[PDB]
Design a protein around this ligand. Sequence first.
Ligand SMILES: CC(=O)N[C@@H]1[C@@H](O)[C@H](O[C@@H]2O[C@H](CO)[C@@H](O[C@@H]3O[C@H](CO)[C@@H](O[C@@H]4O[C@H](CO)[C@@H](O[C@@H]5O[C@H](CO)[C@@H](O[C@@H]6O[C@H](CO)[C@@H](O)[C@H](O)[C@H]6NC(C)=O)[C@H](O)[C@H]5NC(C)=O)[C@H](O)[C@H]4NC(C)=O)[C@H](O)[C@H]3NC(C)=O)[C@H](O)[C@H]2NC(C)=O)[C@@H](CO)O[C@H]1O
Length: 129
Amino acid sequence: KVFGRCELAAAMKRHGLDNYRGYSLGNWVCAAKFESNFNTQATNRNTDGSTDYGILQINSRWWCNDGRTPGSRNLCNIPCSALLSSDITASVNCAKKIVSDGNGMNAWVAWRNRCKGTDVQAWIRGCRL
Ligand SMILES: CC(=O)N[C@@H]1[C@@H](O)[C@H](O[C@@H]2O[C@H](CO)[C@@H](O[C@@H]3O[C@H](CO)[C@@H](O[C@@H]4O[C@H](CO)[C@@H](O[C@@H]5O[C@H](CO)[C@@H](O[C@@H]6O[C@H](CO)[C@@H](O)[C@H](O)[C@H]6NC(C)=O)[C@H](O)[C@H]5NC(C)=O)[C@H](O)[C@H]4NC(C)=O)[C@H](O)[C@H]3NC(C)=O)[C@H](O)[C@H]2NC(C)=O)[C@@H](CO)O[C@H]1O
């Protein structure tokens, strides 16, 4: 699908992320346009041999099952492609605690540079919510 700016953010406030776990709902949406550029069909492999999945862009090495990653933990315990589909109602459940493991957004990398030290808060700006 192609989520336009105001149409790919309101879902967080539909999935339990608004002001969820010390991160304001606003502290998230910026990175989305720095992660897949509002798409769940943008995915890559990694130099590390790690593959990625979805707009979420998770790697199969540590988080989910694609099977080409042996010795991967898979604590999420669900098929990676379960995210890439246009529908995402369930897909947040893993991203939901990926921080809960205590490392924060530090698992995500772009958000420490493209949105961090900047005003992300100016990204969620203007959409009625
Ligand atoms: C296109 C776009 O927008 N983004 C681009 C992206 O697509 C490109 O590719 C990157 O792909 C990678 C995978 O190939 C994607 O995933 C991220 O990969 C990075 C790699 O650097 C991951 O970083 C490390 O991730 C591991 C796994 O979670 C981290 O380990 C956890 O850390 C916790 C705490 O921090 C640890 O816990 C405990 O620590 C205490 C300390 O006191 C200690 O007592 C314990 O012993 C210790 N636990 C043990 C026993 O280990 C624990 O080690 C572990 N827990 C877990 C596994 O949950 C590791 O710490 C991370 N590095 C640091 C340092 O924090 C990152 O986790 C991973 N994220 C995802 C989504 O899974 C990535 O999406 C993607 N890009 C990124 C990352 O932005 C890149 C090309 O390079 O370009 C992007 O732009």
